Coordinates of C-alpha atoms in Angstrom, one line a residue:
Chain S
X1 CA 108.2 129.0 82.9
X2 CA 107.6 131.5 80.4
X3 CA 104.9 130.6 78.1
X4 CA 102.7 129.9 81.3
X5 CA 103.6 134.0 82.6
X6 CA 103.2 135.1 78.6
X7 CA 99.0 133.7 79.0
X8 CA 99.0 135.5 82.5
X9 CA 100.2 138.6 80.7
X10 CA 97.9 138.1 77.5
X11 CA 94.9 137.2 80.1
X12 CA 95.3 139.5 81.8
X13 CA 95.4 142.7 78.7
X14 CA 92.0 141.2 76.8
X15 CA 89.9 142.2 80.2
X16 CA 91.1 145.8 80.2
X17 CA 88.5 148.0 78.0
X18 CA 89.0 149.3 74.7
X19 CA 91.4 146.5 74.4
X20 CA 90.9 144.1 70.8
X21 CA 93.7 141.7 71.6
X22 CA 97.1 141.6 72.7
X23 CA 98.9 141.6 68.8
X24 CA 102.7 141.2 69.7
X25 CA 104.7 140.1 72.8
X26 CA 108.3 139.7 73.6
X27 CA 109.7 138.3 77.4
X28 CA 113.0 138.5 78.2
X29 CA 114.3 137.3 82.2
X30 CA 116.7 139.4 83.8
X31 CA 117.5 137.7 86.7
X32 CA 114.3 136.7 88.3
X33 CA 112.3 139.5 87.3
X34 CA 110.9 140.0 83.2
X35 CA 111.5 143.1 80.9
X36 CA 108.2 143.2 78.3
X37 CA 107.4 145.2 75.4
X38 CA 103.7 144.4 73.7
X39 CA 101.4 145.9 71.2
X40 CA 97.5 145.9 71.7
X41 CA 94.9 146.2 69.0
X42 CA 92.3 149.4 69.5
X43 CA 89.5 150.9 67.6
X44 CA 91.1 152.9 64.4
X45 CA 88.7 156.0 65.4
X46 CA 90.6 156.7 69.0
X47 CA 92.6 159.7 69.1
X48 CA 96.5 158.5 69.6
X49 CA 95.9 160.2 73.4
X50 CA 93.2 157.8 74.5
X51 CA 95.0 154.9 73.3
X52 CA 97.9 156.0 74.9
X53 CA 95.0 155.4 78.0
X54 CA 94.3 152.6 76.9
X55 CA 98.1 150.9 77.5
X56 CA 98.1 153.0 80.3
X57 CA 95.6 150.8 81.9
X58 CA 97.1 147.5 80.4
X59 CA 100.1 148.6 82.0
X60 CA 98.4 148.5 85.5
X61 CA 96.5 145.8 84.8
X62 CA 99.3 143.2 83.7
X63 CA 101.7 144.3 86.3
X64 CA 99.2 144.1 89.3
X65 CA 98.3 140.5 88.5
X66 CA 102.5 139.6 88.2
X67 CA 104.5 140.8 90.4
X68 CA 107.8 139.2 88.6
X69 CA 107.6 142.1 85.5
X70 CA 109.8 145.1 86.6
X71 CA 108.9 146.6 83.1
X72 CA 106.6 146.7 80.4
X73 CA 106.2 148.7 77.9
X74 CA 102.9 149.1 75.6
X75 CA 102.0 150.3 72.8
X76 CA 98.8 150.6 70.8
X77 CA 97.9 149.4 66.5
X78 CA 94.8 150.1 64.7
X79 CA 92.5 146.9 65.0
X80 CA 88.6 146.1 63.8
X81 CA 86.3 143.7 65.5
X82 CA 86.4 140.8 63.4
X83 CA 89.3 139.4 61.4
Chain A
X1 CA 128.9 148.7 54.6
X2 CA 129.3 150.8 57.6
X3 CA 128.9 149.6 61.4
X4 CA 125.5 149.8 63.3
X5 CA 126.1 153.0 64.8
X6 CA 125.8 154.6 61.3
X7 CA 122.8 152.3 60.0
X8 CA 121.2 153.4 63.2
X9 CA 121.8 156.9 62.5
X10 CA 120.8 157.2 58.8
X11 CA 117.5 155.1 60.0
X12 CA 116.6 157.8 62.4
X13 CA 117.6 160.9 60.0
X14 CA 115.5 159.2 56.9
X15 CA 112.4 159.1 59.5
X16 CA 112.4 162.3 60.9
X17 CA 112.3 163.7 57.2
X18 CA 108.5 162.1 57.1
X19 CA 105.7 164.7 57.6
X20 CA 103.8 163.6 60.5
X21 CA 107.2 162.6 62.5
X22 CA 107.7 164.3 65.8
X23 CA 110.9 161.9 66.6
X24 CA 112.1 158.6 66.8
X25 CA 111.6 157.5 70.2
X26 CA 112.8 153.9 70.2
X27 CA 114.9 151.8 67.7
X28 CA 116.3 148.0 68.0
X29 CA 117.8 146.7 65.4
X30 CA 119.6 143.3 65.1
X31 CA 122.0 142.0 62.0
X32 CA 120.5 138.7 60.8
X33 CA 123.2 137.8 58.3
X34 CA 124.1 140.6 56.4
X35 CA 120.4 141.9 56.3
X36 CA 118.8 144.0 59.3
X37 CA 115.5 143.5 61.4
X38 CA 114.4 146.6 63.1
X39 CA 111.5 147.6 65.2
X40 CA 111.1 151.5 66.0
X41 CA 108.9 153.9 67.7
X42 CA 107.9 157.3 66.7
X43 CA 106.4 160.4 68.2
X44 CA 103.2 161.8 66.6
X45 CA 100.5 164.4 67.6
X46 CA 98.4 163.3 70.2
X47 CA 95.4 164.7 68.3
X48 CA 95.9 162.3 65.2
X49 CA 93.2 159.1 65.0
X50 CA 95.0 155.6 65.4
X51 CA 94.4 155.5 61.4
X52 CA 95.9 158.6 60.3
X53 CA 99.5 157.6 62.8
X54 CA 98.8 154.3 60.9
X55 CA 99.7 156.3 57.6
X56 CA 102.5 158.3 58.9
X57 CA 103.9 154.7 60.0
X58 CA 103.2 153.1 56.7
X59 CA 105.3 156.1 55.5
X60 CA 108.3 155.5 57.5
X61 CA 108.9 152.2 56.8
X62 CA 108.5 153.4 52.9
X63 CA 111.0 156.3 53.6
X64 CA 113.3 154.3 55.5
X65 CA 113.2 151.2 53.6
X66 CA 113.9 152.5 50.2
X67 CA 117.0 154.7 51.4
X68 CA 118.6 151.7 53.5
X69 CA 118.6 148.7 51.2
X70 CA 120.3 146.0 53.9
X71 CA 117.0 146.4 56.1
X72 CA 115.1 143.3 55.4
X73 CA 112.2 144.0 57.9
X74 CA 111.1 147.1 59.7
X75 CA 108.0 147.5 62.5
X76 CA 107.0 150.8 63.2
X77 CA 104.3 152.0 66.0
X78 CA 103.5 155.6 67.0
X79 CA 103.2 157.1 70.6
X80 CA 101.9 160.6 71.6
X81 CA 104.6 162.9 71.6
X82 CA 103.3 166.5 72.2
X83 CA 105.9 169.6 71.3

């Protein structure tokens, strides 16, 4: 049910660039359809304008690939490489 | 002490004081016994690194957190919010 759609979601954020991670994620259903809110990691050295890009293209990205998510919102958190 | 209308209200009045703070944009917040989790959103210049919002963040959950003792947890992430 949901943890299935929360690894679409996930999957589907980590191929859009400039992305390091999906950090938090929270699903509710409302009726059939899913309300979202998630955090993505990006580089520290991004100006708060191209990350806002960045979850811009997320957005797209996660709810072209399913179709149930009438919202999501995204926002971005400093994140390295590594660790 | 006093509802969650007030909380709510002295949360958002303690974070707009912080220098760097162009709004709060979002706020959730949720009684677990008599202790509060809260998550929040605030505006900051577009023009700031994903670092230096990082700070003003770090800030407002100092500010906030040390003039509202009952908050127990508080997340804070920063969106582009432009004048």
């Amino acid at each position: 049910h949901m943890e299935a759609v929360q690894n679409r979601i996930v999957e589907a954020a980590e191929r859009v660039p400039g992305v390091r991670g999906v950090i938090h994620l929270r699903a509710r259903y409302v009726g059939q359809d899913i309300w979202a809110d998630m955090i993505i990691g990006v580089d520290p050295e991004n100006t708060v304008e191209q990350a806002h890009e960045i979850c811009e293209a997320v957005q797209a990205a996660v709810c072209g690939k399913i179709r149930r998510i009438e919202s999501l919102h995204v926002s971005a958190d400093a994140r390295e490489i590594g660790d």
